[PDB]
Amino acid sequence: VDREPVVCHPDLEERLQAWPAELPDEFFELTVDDVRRRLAQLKSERKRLEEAPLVTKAFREAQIKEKLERYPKVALRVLFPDRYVLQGFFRPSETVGDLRDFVRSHLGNPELSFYLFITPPKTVLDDHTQTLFQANLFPAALVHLGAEEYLEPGLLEHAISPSAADVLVARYMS
Amino acid sequence: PVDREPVVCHPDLEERLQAWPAELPDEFFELTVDDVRRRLAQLKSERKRLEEAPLVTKAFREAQIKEKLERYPKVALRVLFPDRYVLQGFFRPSETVGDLRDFVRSHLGNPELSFYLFITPPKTVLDDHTQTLFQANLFPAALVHLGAEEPAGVYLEPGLLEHAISPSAADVLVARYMSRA
Amino acid sequence: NRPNRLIVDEAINEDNSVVSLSQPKMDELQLFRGDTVLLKGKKRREAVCIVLSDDTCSDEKIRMNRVVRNNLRVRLGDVISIQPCPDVKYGKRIHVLPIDDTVEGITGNLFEVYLKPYFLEAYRPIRKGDIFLVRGGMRAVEFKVVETDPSPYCIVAPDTVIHCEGEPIKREDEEESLNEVGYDDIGGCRKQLAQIKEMVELPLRHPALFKAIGVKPPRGILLYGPPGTGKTLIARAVANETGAFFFLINGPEIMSKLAGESESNLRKAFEEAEKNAPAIIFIDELDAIAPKREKTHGEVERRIVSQLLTLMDGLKQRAHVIVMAATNRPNSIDPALRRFGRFDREVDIGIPDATGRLEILQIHTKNMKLADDVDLEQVANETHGHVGADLAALCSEAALQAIRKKMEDETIDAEVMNSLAVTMDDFRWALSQSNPQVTWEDIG
Amino acid sequence: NRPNRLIVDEAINEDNSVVSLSQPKMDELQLFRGDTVLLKGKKRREAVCIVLSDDTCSDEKIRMNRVVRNNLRVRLGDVISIQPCPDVKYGKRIHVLPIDDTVEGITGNLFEVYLKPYFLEAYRPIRKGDIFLVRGGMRAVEFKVVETDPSPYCIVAPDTVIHCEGEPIKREDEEESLNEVGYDDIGGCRKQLAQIKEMVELPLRHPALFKAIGVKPPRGILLYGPPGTGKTLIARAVANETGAFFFLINGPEIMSAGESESNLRKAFEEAEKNAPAIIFIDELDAIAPKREKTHGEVERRIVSQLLTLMDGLKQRAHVIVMAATNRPNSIDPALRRFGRFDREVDIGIPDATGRLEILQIHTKNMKLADDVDLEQVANETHGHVGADLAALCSEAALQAIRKKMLEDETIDAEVMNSLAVTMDDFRWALSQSNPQVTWEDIG
Ligand SMILES: Nc1ncnc2c1ncn2[C@@H]1O[C@H](COP(=O)(O)OP(=O)(O)O)[C@@H](O)[C@H]1O
Ligand SMILES: Nc1ncnc2c1ncn2[C@@H]1O[C@H](COP(=O)(O)OP(=O)(O)O)[C@@H](O)[C@H]1O
Ligand SMILES: [Mg+2]
Ligand SMILES: [Mg+2]
């Protein structure tokens, strides 16, 4: 697939859209509906732990398949130490190795050594053969980047606002 | 990397003149106090295990694998043909069904013809060419059958059939190899 | 010391032709996974098998299932001899016939339904006289190898002509029905089978050798739990697997007899048991004979209780008899019966958990063709509270439903019966009716 | 309804900065996994957290650990609002200081032992006033965020200077101590916890709303099992997690005429005084043991008072009574009949999985060497209860200390932090299991 690479930076944000979102006291007030809903879950969890059912092969296979059909496309964001975000579309069956290749091909210096990680706590993505589905970088996930001591300068000049990047994602995900 | 050291044998090459193994005495089949003590001991510890219901620990699983791979770094495979010819070869546990198929293909008379590999019983086809011999339990010595969709009776390269050996000579070859030689 | 001398143990692998050894034992005998092996027991009947390795064997153990045990006339614990057998030539032709009491109700092509798929590229080693079992069409059929060519053993290969014309044959006296109950008929009771085997196996199986070890055998064992959890199943399976004689006493049935007659039937039971020793006497519903009663002034101990206690206290070790009793709760029973030397051992055969139910469902579907949509784990999850009898009934009901969806007589054609697939819908049907017909169909 | 309204649920993720939502809820709110969110409870104290997806919770749920709940001053079941918080600036500087009662007996470089590794390239979002937890050196230290620049929250980035000079600060009364017993302190009772929550959470948490749904509250609850299975622990956690007041009555102590019924009455009066409350009677049998025969014998004056106090509590009082005993049969049957201790829960001997969970709880603060195999330890502790396992871990820690010696009322943090507990230390503890230094409080 084509990644449709895009770069955004929080200093390019142009909107202060709708701030006085003052929230009423009763929003936080628990209703009879709320209490009943909690009890249901408790009853439900009591029954399950008493009956100790099997987690079935068919259920496990159904969840995998149901999630891979629900999210055929993956949007990833690699956040740089200078707060630049590189955004790219992927498929869930693609690997962490592919992500690294995406990053490398958009670096100012492609020979420079880097590591990708999620946080918190800091967890490096070492297994390059691990898929994005297995890595849980799916359906939309934020990844950080670090180096031992970066994005192509031409690409920084076409950087957009984060909120603009968001709408690109929403539109791609339908 | 691994010397396959390929050989072929056929049951029709055994000698058939030497004596039968000596008949066992009646006492052989007679159970002793010692046998009964060991059986009881096994029953006792199986009962305990089932009462305590211990975990099968990660460390245990990993050590079991590690010990097996160290204990059997070399694998003897035998592929048995419809005509009863056997092709024998040495492999690593980490090698694959695909490697086995390649080996078989290397020694076929018609390298183009289609074949499947299976274990029995019951018939269980080896369809995953990526599976390692360890994973497939073709390890440390295993016997595999060969089948073909159209059984045209050529299979093995006829030059090798000239040098076929006895089954028990093939066994010795395996014993020597497995003692690391 | 004697590497070729092995001790019979129970199978994990349920294929007829297969036996299992520890890998170090296979190293020692220089066997390949898949090699043919020749086996002999005390009676010196031979069997030919394929050998696999097993990760859970002790080095002296040979794991084998009931088909091979019967062919060898051995039982769990017995000695066998192992020798390699690579000589075995490919069969020109074989003659196999069904055993009569296994084919009642069926007609048609037994070759196509049972024999063809069983031998199909399986390269199975066989012996003249072998009895083997094939499952299919809601039924487990037993076949005997009448003759082979070459004789007496061969490999059934693709070229081997399989002949099966002729009348069904009579079961021989020492030939045990594989329909008889054994350990492989019990699910969800691993822990309890282990507890019971530890108590009774050796005393019943090797009484003289057991005494020499000096530890005292149990006299009475109390099995407890709700109805249909497999208490009779277990006692019967232990009797069969040990070769011990089995005498069942039904509690309410013996109490229905007139005063005087009860006590005498009770005595006859024990005499019969002592006579055919080693033996198991099984008292179903013990609480019907000796219930726990409230303390009433001048209450005389029931004649029947006195008689049972006398019989318990009178069974010396040398009688080689063990008494098992089934109750719902241990407290439902006269405490006099629970004192040392009587029923001083008790084993909880309770309601099975999800894993237990799965095992039980697999046992009771093993003769059925299940469609790919059949999910027994799901069935197990939906049967919390069901015991063994509920699950066996459920399987009969799912199967009856499949038959109703298709087809009446006392005879069915093998190929028709074999085309039956029980579906998940059939189970859902049986589930909706579950609340804990035709002659040619035998249901568990 | 309103998609930003969520319900606080227990967490699977133990990390301070992490909350979890169902994937459909994240889709709805257009949230990337790993993204920053802003949270508020009814007290309007806000928190900034990182959001992850969780496969087990329903759409309206937000899974959060106790650290986050305290910061938002919420409890399980309370409402929070969620809004995306993309606008989080990287801190120029921050100030954090330890809570005094967590750092007693410790001296030296707190920054290097606790703070530096905790923040190191973790990009943690933090808010002035936040209390957070860093584990290490057989200890759990709590820190407060005194200041941030910019305010009132920021990301702790590599470039952020972390100041931490100053005096350890006093705990505030409104600030719940994280040393208080919670659900996350209990292992191997996942079933029994659920059984107890189902019965008491709602009546204790929302008395008014509970009575409105018609169902009657449990009068008395009986927890049974051998000593040290966690009966006190459970009752304490339920009180703490529901906000309920907790009163412990020690049966044997009360039984050692006259002053006994004075204590009993006052205990009950203090409970309804501070309602909603749990009254916990430890070893009930000591007070009301099963009596034999005694036909024309007068009921004990103590047993009578207890029935009076118990029957004299209407649903209105907001009190639930819990009792510990070994076997329910050791109790007088007058208490075990309806309107009294009519409900019972078995807190029995833990299994292997149960034991592992308990061992994981009581090793939380220890540095364990790579060779430490807690599963093996679980397997070798058949029959052990929670208290045995806690003691075992304590013995293993002391064994590690013995091997290293240092003496005083004070230890250096870096010294204390270099203590690795090895498998050999557990083997020692194992060999000594048969069911000192002030700078160290062991579990
Ligand atoms: N544990 C079990 N495994 C397999 N089948 C069982 C089990 N328990 C019961 N059944 C089936 O249902 C019947 C149970 O009857 P029974 O053994 O008399 O139970 P109980 O003795 O407890 O009354 C058995 O004949 C068997 O068909
Ligand atoms: N399930 C458990 N999980 C974790 N720790 C436990 C558990 N049960 C007991 N403990 C430990 O044992 C100590 C004593 O337990 P306690 O609640 O007094 O048990 P009981 O009241 O059943 O005698 C607790 O403070 C705790 O450290
Ligand atoms: Mg019954
Ligand atoms: Mg206690």
Residue numbers in the entry:
A (entry chain C): 318 to 466, 471 to 495
B (entry chain A): 317 to 497
C (entry chain B): 21 to 427, 433 to 461, 473 to 480
D (entry chain D): 21 to 276, 279 to 427, 432 to 461, 473 to 480
Please quote the paper that reports this structure.
The AAA+ ATPase p97, also known as VCP (valosin-containing protein) in mammals or Cdc48 in yeast, is a homohexameric ring-shaped molecular machine that together with partner proteins controls a plethora of essential cellular processes such as ubiquitin-dependent protein degradation, maintenance of quality control or homotypic membrane fusion. It comprises four domains: a flexible N-terminal domain (N), two AAA+ ATPase domains (D1 and D2) and an unstructured C-terminal tail1920. p97 is an essential protein, with orthologues in archaea and all eukaryotes. Biochemical and structural studies revealed that a C-terminal fragment of ASPL is necessary and sufficient for p97 binding. This fragment causes efficient p97 hexamer disassembly and spontaneous formation of a heterotetrameric p97:ASPL protein complex.
Two molecules each of p97-ND1 and ASPL-C were present in the asymmetric unit of the crystal, forming a compact heterotetrameric p97-ND1:ASPL-C protein complex. Two heterodimeric p97-ND1:ASPL-C units were found to be interlocked with each other, forming a central cavity with a diameter of ∼17 Å. The overall structure of the p97-ND1 fragment in the heterotetramer shows high similarity to p97-ND1 in p47 bound hexamers (r.m.s.d.=0.95 Å). However, we found that the N- and C-terminal regions of the UBX domain in ASPL-C contain unique structural extensions, which were not observed in previously reported UBX-domain-containing proteins. Strikingly, the α-helical lariat wraps around almost the entire Na subdomain of p97, suggesting that it is critical for the conversion of hexamers into heterotetramers. It shows that the α-helical lariat directly targets the D1:D1 interprotomer interface in p97 hexamers, a region critical for hexamer stability, suggesting that it might play an important role in the dissociation of p97 homohexamers.
